Amino acid sequence: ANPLYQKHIISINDLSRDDLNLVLATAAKLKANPQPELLKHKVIASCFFEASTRTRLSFETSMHRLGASVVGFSDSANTSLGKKGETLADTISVISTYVDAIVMRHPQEGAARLATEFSGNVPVLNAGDGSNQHPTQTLLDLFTIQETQGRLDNLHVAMVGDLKYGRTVHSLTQALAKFDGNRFYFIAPDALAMPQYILDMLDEKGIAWSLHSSIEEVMAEVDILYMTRVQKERLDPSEYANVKAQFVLRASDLHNAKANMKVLHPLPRVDEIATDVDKTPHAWYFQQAGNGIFARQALLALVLNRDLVL
Amino acid sequence: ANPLYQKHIISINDLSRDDLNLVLATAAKLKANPQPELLKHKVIASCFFEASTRTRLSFETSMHRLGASVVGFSDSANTSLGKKGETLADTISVISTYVDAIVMRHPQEGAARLATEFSGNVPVLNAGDGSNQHPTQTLLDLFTIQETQGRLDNLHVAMVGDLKYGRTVHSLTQALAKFDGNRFYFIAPDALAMPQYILDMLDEKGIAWSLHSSIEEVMAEVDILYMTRVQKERLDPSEYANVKAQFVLRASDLHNAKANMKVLHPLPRVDEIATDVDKTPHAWYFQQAGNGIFARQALLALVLNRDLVL
Amino acid sequence: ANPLYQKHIISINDLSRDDLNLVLATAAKLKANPQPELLKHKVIASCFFEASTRTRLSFETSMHRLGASVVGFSDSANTSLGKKGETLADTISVISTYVDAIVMRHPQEGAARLATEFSGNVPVLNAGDGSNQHPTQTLLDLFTIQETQGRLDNLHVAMVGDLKYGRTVHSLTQALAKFDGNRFYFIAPDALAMPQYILDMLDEKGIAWSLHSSIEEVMAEVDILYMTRVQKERLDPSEYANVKAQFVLRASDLHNAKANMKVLHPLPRVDEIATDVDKTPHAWYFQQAGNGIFARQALLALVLNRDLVL
Amino acid sequence: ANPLYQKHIISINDLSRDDLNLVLATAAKLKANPQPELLKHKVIASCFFEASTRTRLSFETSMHRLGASVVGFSDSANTSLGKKGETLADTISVISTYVDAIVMRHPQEGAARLATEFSGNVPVLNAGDGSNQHPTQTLLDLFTIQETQGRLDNLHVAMVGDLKYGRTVHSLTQALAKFDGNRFYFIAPDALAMPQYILDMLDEKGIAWSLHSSIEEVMAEVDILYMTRVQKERLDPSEYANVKAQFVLRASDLHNAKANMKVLHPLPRVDEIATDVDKTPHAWYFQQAGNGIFARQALLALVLNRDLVL
Amino acid sequence: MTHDNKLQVEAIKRGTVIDHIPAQIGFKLLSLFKLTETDQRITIGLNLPSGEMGRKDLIKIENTFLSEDQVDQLALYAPQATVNRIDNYEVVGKSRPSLPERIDNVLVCPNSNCISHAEPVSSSFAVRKRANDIALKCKYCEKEFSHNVVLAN
Amino acid sequence: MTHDNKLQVEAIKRGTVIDHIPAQIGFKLLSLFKLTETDQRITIGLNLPSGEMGRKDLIKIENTFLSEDQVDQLALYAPQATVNRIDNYEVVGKSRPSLPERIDNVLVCPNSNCISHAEPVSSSFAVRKRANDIALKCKYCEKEFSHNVVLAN
Ligand SMILES: [Zn+2]
Ligand SMILES: [Zn+2]
Q1: Where Zn(2+) is bound, by residue (chains E, F)?
Q2: Residue D209's closest CA among D230, D227, D195?
């Protein structure tokens, strides 16, 4: 019945605004009044062809908080000793006959989509197919912004870090560009700046955006500060270093931030955000995490429950 | 309500006598009248940063026998490929927001304690932080002695093996030293003898103890015989060998043991205890195991149930 | 005694204009009149802390051809597979106590240099140290050029591929800078342009360089084309595909090619240089490759012998 | 023919008092008047069943310096990485059919010895066999001593570190036992004292030894200090820290040090010998290290040549 | 007035102040307890006689008053010494170096594991005395050592 | 001048001392330049407004002639400061901190892979001037970083 019954969750791109608001709505409602038996008697494959424990646990917890049972695997690097002894399709076909739903993660792009064409009516939820999608992350990002900012419309968002290879970002910025108002700020080094296609897409919906060299500029005017980990391997020791501890965020830098402003991070961190931040009141990167439980929990309900209304 | 509600279980050292008797009391009661739904609707992270399946299963079974759901991991040697890409603290912080409790095991000492300061009100239960604690083992040891000996006071206990590096031991001997009566016997080679600080602590509470060269001496006068595996790597092939099959226990050696006397082992064995023992009536090392289910099951109930009374 | 007898060989920089000349003459002189006993009864240590077959055989071969005895090791040995083992300081101290020369390759910038302050009067020759110096490549390249062009001045040099990380390119454009009338045309994806520091040095020397997007553009007047490869990992798997435009040579693009022109490449080569090129008379990456047996051969000579008459 | 022409070299024990003398004179004689063709046209098999770079280069270097050709292998090869492959018997049978000498290092006590009963008239030289013999260390040590002290009798020798497992110490205190007027001062943590078997041999020979807790105690009259390291794994990580008292030398403890005194150490060294020591004129672990090129060099000579005139 | 000898200093302004510190131990207390993470008069001087067999160090701050216990957490280093807070122009508070129950952020459970290393936490031990030395129990590793072993790397 | 002045800021006994050093950028110098590492006498004054006012840190060494070299290497932090060779309130000389050519032992290569780290050697760099930066080339790692890039840590 509900707009998203028996349907797949692959790319963030293909989600209506009504679509999104629905999931979020559910989220905050499921958060408010925890329904541990909604999904009683359902079995769900937590398939991780590409290991991401942090993710598995998060997802798998929602599968539990809803009375559902879970079975799966985390075929890592000592499990993925086989490059030619079971095609994904065939695996999906087989696995598609035991369970009620498939939450799969994959090293390769296109996987979730593919599995779709081999799962019959069994639903598949992409937990990250290569460097493509991972709708699940984007939604908890969102959910977190809205609940802290009351809206997802007319907001100032900062995006810091490796903007070039950070999908989580591309995904979020696209989603956001689905709402009115909103001015963007991308403070990332020159060899990791935000990609053109993203800019253009913002050029098209006539969306406010400017680039900066350091968060200090904009810091005063942002509601959301989204930190992303840079990696040394995306550059070189000297290079990286020569800018690493440059786009890092430390406690001293929040002296002019808005009470409402919150700092975010898809995690894991390491450098991007100094430990002394974790205490200020703008640190919501952890609340951002626990919130992925109501985004992922909400999604499974909608897809598996014919009609939901708290 | 109950003395141990919402509280952490880190080091055996910090447990009152009332504390202990409580857990044990629960244990034998939970054993007597199995309550499979007490923990219905609770989720518990079975975190094993340091793999110990034998332990995981044991713990995880108690989590189940109580109607609780479980999600976790066993980040071993092909999972622990990362020495600097997620601090424990941050992990605990994150994970601390999904679940109701955290049963964690760690390669390093101090971990459980640390996690405590980053889990909010979520409880953490140490399953063995390095070479420090592992209260969980000690309790099932105990539980096993009491139920077989009717008391934990005024008893003759034998401790055989690598007494120097065997924490399980240190832990047990300390706990025992929390009761009256009790005379100790430590039959371990010279380079693996019981540590001084332990002796002294027994010197202090004025506790009976003597050393021996072989269990045969004392064998006639012991209620409890606690076997521990020695390891070849704690010495050298010749050395070890030249004493290995020396502090081993075989069937022939029980010809003068008390009916009530029982043989124990934290397991796994290999040498310490000849197979022919497994049949005598003194072999309780396996009953000792299955009993870890009521020690660990009991602990979770107390920590998670506000008030318990069978 | 020659200007290099007993001197170390670490950076391409540490080489005077007049120096390079000596090394080269020498090299050619050994290509005409080979001296198999020049380094007779000399023992060299081919040390490959950073495993690398290619450079090892080239180097060692260009070691036996002088009657020198070899001894050494590839990959991480006595000091592990990437952990604890002992300082490089301590290794060089020990080894330099029994060899008449050190040839070491290492993964961290400055190992050769560090070693130099620990080998006593035993010379050390850098076989590449991380992203720092690899003197034999730049030298073996030059010689090759000098041989197919007759001069190392008043030349048009083109460099294609990854120039932002190209270790071998930088020093090559550093060295040629030590010469007159050289015109440079750099061709590379923006994501990976020639470092600024290099250009700055090119201008502050009155040197002429221009950038391009396609080989074709400058193909016309180039005497030397220097190909390099951009490993996939240097860019998103898809990024790579997109702009993997003409940054890979194909024989079809060599009609208005200067007869004297030569194609060079450090190797190994993957995609950038099509097979069909191998037929034409411009392909020299191979001849360039076997030339490095004389450059390295010359070096050993120069450094170990003084009245070097050839 | 000399007393060792064509004899095997396995145990430090198998060496007569008068023998060691021959080897040493020889060694010095090769340090003054080096003989590059002594072993010309002889082919030796540097076999490293038990991989160990350090001893391999020392040995092989002290192989080329005599015009001998080398051939061999490190780590486990044709017989795996630690499983099934074939008997050592069968290997030695095959190899001894084409080399003029065998130099093998192995991980199990008695491999060299076993090999000896299978090499036909091909000599075998032990490069250490597990926890048994390592003749070249003890010999290269002695020579060094003999060189800095002028004699190997009427001396004060100190040995610090792990003496209970120190392979190299034992045989060193076994050998010096074959001499007169030597006074021994052993310094080590009790957990790791000098084996009893050694003391018993010291007394039944009228040899004088005393034990200490700190280097300082005997520092005064020692001609030779022999440092060794106790790897962490030889004791609880914390045990180690605690008593890691003075069992690691530091230059500050060398004022009332006998001018002739020399510090020695097999190596590699980790903590036990501070860097600043390296400056003073007592540090000889290095010179001692390069001396073993003459001991091993002498051996090969002695064993392969008969009318050894040097 | 007018005898024979020279000087330049004496008892100056307000603030908490310090008496007696061994040699080379002075500077320590500074870096260790972060005695400059401010803008107040933190003037001092080392290796000057004030009553001892060879050396002695003294400290001088103003506007900042020590915790009537923090004192403790500072002890150990200067075996015997004094505070003597200087509230308004003159002497007004004699204190002495007594052992704290604990001592945080200054030491290191010398146990290569003892968790607190790559971890963002304050090193807390546990003071205990006997005779040959002083013992302290790693709050995290629960491994005890003598102040000596802990005082070093 | 009876109007305003200052109680502190002296000039006693033989010893080469400095003058005028940035605020909260002097203590950092004592450590960095293995100073206290000796058993000599020295008075120190931090948060002291000089004859120049601009809040500064300040020493006062006893019999320890100071020199041009270790002198030049004092810029960077306290570029503008002075070293007058005294012999008991005797300005028998002086000079200033001209930016040195090299600068060993005290800085750190920001290069995670710079070999310098785990090894038994002295950190050595190179000095040069840009619009706003100071170019430094990790002598070993051979990479060039910005002075503020290296000092941040
Ligand atoms: Zn600790
Ligand atoms: Zn460097």
Answers
A1: 109, 114, 138, 141
A2: D195
